[PDB]
């Protein structure tokens, strides 16, 4: 009964478990660019 709605700016991060090297990172302010 919980709603998670990505209808506003959001962040994504791809993190290596062992090194915490960050492979990729993004901020989405407008998916329609």
């Amino acid at each position: 009964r919980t709603i998670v709605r990505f209808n506003r700016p959001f962040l994504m991060i791809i993190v290596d478990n062992f090194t915490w090297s960050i492979f990729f990172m993004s901020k989405v302010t407008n998916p329609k660019q």
Binding site: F10, I13, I14, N17, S21, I22, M25, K27, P31, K32
Partner: protein, 336 residues
């Protein structure tokens, strides 16, 4: 070591905030690992202040992790980023494109191959369009068509180009059904909004954490690399960005518990960005590499090379079956 983690996160978040500051409302996509691997690869041939400025720019503490342990961590990491599954496609490559007659130290070519997986390609930079096509095809091949035109302008007096690419394709644990994708509002801000294809799933059990303190929710939608989706409340993106750090990233990880989600909505979309990183890298203290005081004599045996341009390009695809990420970094080097 654990001091590598503290460096990697500081570098990634430092770079991110600098990318945002240039245009604070634009989409951002980039690969911190791609950029730091290309610079670490360069530092194999650096000495003295040129070398220390690079490794410090990457947020490494030389007293804490030696140069050999940094290269060792990169080597180990590169080998893990070439994998294939029914759920994962990973690939990462390094290469140096070199003026055909330019003599390279044996130690440098050996180190470059052993630690960074890099071959050396004789290239005719004076034939600028052909050299550019050579490098852009190598990146296009490496990223399976996703990063094109990484190099747009190439000085015809170029001596070498160090290139990194990375490709990451991953299927969702629970895919979205395309029948359930429908046009929905996306709010740029509280009163500016557009319509985008919005994917949806019902009754998902996924790692979850509501952080009422920072006014955000984080979830995980997927190997040995985690993918975090961080969803600030409206008008709380800036606040959330202000709190990004190793500390709060660790807190996000230590607070994710599995939880059943009634409905999950996520846009179907593609964004890309390209940057020139000279300003940012100078701002990070990597400065001697760009001047006639550059010391890259570990490459050739003389101080006859300096960096001219660092470019970066990245692309992100989000669709019903999963996500696709790719990026590349080129470090262009002139004679001196």
């Amino acid at each position: 070591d654990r001091g590598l983690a503290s460096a990697n996160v500081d570098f990634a978040f430092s770079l991110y905030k600098q990318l945002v500051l240039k245009a604070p409302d634009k989409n951002v996509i980039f690969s911190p690992l791609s950029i730091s691997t290309a610079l670490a690869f360069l530092s194999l041939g650096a000495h003295n202040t040129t070398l220390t400025e690079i490794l410090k720019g990457l947020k490494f503490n030389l007293t804490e992790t030696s140069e050999a342990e940094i290269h060792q961590s990169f080597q180990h990491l590169l080998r893990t980023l070439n994998q294939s599954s029914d759920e994962l496609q990973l690939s990462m490559g390094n290469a140096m494109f070199v003026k055909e007659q330019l003599s390279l130290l044996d130690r440098f070519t050996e180190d470059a191959k052993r630690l960074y997986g890099s071959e050396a390609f004789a290239t005719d930079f004076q034939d600028s369009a052909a050299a550019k096509k050579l490098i852009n095809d190598y990146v296009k091949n490496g990223t399976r068509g996703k990063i094109t035109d990484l190099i747009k302008d190439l000085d015809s007096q170029t001596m070498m180009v160090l290139v990194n690419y990375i490709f990451f394709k991953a299927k969702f644990e629970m895919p979205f059904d395309p029948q359930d994708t429908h046009q929905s509002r996306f709010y740029l801000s509280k009163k500016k909004y557009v319509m985008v294809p919005m994917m949806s799933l019902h009754h998902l059990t996924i790692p979850y954490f509501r952080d009422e303190e920072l006014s955000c929710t984080v979830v995980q939608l997927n190997g040995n690399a985690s993918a975090l989706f961080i969803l600030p409340d409206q008008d709380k993106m800036e606040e959330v960005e202000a709190m990004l750090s190793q500390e709060t990233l660790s807190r996000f990880f230590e607070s994710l518990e599995f939880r059943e989600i009634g409905e999950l909505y996520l846009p179907k979309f593609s964004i890309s960005r390209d940057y020139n990183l000279n300003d940012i890298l100078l701002q990070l203290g990597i400065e001697e590499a760009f001047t006639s005081k550059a010391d890259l004599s570990g490459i050739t045996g003389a101080r006859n090379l300096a960096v001219s341009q660092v470019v970066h390009k990245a692309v992100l695809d989000v669709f019903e079956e999963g996500t696709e990420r790719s990026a590349a970094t080129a470090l262009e080097v002139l004679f001196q």
